[PDB]
Design a protein around this ligand. Structure first.
Ligand SMILES: [Mg+2]
Ligand SMILES: [Mg+2]
Ligand SMILES: [Mg+2]
Length: 464
């Protein structure tokens, strides 16, 4: 019998970094409900908690950077929170999740997995009391804390990627969690490490004692899948209110039904039954905003209980960064996109990584060495007409994003006429392409989520 696994994301992260992994666990026999995700406000956590000296402030670095855009009065309110109180509140909520999971499954202990800042969070959590540590069969720490001992008596696995994808003004000649089994994937980058099928295999074997029969997201039988998802605020992860309209679409992004096949008021959570292998447009209207959001992604092939749709909201309203252009005349005639992949898009070649991604928008590669260098760990690439001047200047950095963790931007004019072609040729092999309507930036925002792994028949065969 499998025991539940509970995943704790990092700064500016969410359940999305464990979506693929949850589906791999289920493909290998785990009831899908046994894979839990614990979400929390990462801005308050990084600034209030991880700025202490337990780890000499290491767990807070990306939070310090991303916080630059917070309004002064709001920042002060955030920093005024009691640190001991935030900790006890958040940790008590994880106790509840773990206790409910043990009762639901009948298991005696759970496996806990943390990514990046989530590893700092979990080391504090298990060391906070013997009762908390007692409920953990295995602890997995992905590309986060290092130079510390594994919590006493808890079998710990630490998996590390290439440090070039993280801030390097520090000098770790090696990252090790003492007394843990340490595994290294030097050809992988920060978030990629969290979502990789190779990481999946190492984790499954560590906690189960045998290699999984497959690391593929195996499609399930039948024509329908259950999807449980949430619309939540980027980085702070609070539930977001709005209206969800789902439309099945063709290969060119045209809606196949006049009316949406699902229409609902949402407050964070939502659950829907959809057709397996079908392309959908998830249209979202958030309360109090005039923009209509159109979310695109590959079809679902099995139940997915961890889908996440990110929404820009205060205090960290990152979308405000593209407001000047959205308010310009060119917005009526040009589109604005956010391309997301939880596996760094890399345009700079490094022999250790071994290859570069190519990301084409209307036939132009925006994943260049200047826009997607390895050190920026690009998981979110904003594509819009910077300056609203009708000129593409890919060689000139879009400076406003330089300090934003995991994001970059490309100044490319995308005509809001007809459709937009978007394709990624993955550095690890395979390609995924989308053709969608060219919604104008004045009224619409377009979010395209690339899959974090592509299994290509020919490439797999060539390797075999
Ligand atoms: Mg064991
Ligand atoms: Mg059938
Ligand atoms: Mg421009």
């Amino acid at each position: 019998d499998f025991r539940p696994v509970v995943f704790v994301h990092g700064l500016a992260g969410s359940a999305g970094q464990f979506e693929s992994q949850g589906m791999r666990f289920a493909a290998n026999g785990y009831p899908a409900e046994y894979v839990k995700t614990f979400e929390y406000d990462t801005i308050s956590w990084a600034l209030v908690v991880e700025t202490d000296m337990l780890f000499s402030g290491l767990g807070s670095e990306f939070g310090l950077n991303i916080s630059q855009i917070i309004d002064p009065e709001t920042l002060d309110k955030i920093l005024s929170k009691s640190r001991e109180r935030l900790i006890d509140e958040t940790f008590s909520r994880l106790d509840r999740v773990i206790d409910e999971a043990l009762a639901e499954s009948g298991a005696d202990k759970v496996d806990l997995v943390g990514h990046s800042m989530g590893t700092f969070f979990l080391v504090r959590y298990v060391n906070s009391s013997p009762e908390r540590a007692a409920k953990v069969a295995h602890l997995i720490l992905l590309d986060g804390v290092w130079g510390v001992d594994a919590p006493e008596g808890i079998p710990t696995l630490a998996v590390f990627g290439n440090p070039k994808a993280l801030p390097a003004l520090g000098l770790p000649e090696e990252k090790v969690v003492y007394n843990a089994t340490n595994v290294y994937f030097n050809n992988m980058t920060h978030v990629q490490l969290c979502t990789s099928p190779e990481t999946f295999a190492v984790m499954f074997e560590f906690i189960n004692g045998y290699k999984p029969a497959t690391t593929d997201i195996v499609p399930q039988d039948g024509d329908y899948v259950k999807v449980k998802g949430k619309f939540l605020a980027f980085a702070t992860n609070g539930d977001v209110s709005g209206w969800l309209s789902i439309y099945p679409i063709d290969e060119n992004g045209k809606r196949l039904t006049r009316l949406p096949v699902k229409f609902m008021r949402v407050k964070g959570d939502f659950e829907v039954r959809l057709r397996k292998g079908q392309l959908y447009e998830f249209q979202f209207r958030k309360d109090f905003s005039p923009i209509i959001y159109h979310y695109y992604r590959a079809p679902f092939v099995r139940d997915d209980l961890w889908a996440r749709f990110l929404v820009s909201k205060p205090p960290l309203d990152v979308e405000l960064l593209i407001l000047p252009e959205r308010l310009s005349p060119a917005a009526k005639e040009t589109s604005g996109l956010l391309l997301i992949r939880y596996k760094e898009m890399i345009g700079e070649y490094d022999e250790e990584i071994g290859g570069v991604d190519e990301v084409y928008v209307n036939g132009v590669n925006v994943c260049t060495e200047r826009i997607c260098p390895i050190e920026r760990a690009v998981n979110g690439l904003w594509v819009f007409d910077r300056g609203a001047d009708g000129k593409s200047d890919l060689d000139r950095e879009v400076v406003r994003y330089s300090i934003m963790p995991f994001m970059s931007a490309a100044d490319l004019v995308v005509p809001a006429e007809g459709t937009i072609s978007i394709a990624v040729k993955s550095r690890t092999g395979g390609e995924e392409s989308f053709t969608i309507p060219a919604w104008s930036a004045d009224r619409h925002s377009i979010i395209v989520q690339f899959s974090d792994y592509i299994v290509d028949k020919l490439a797999a065969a060539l390797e075999h």
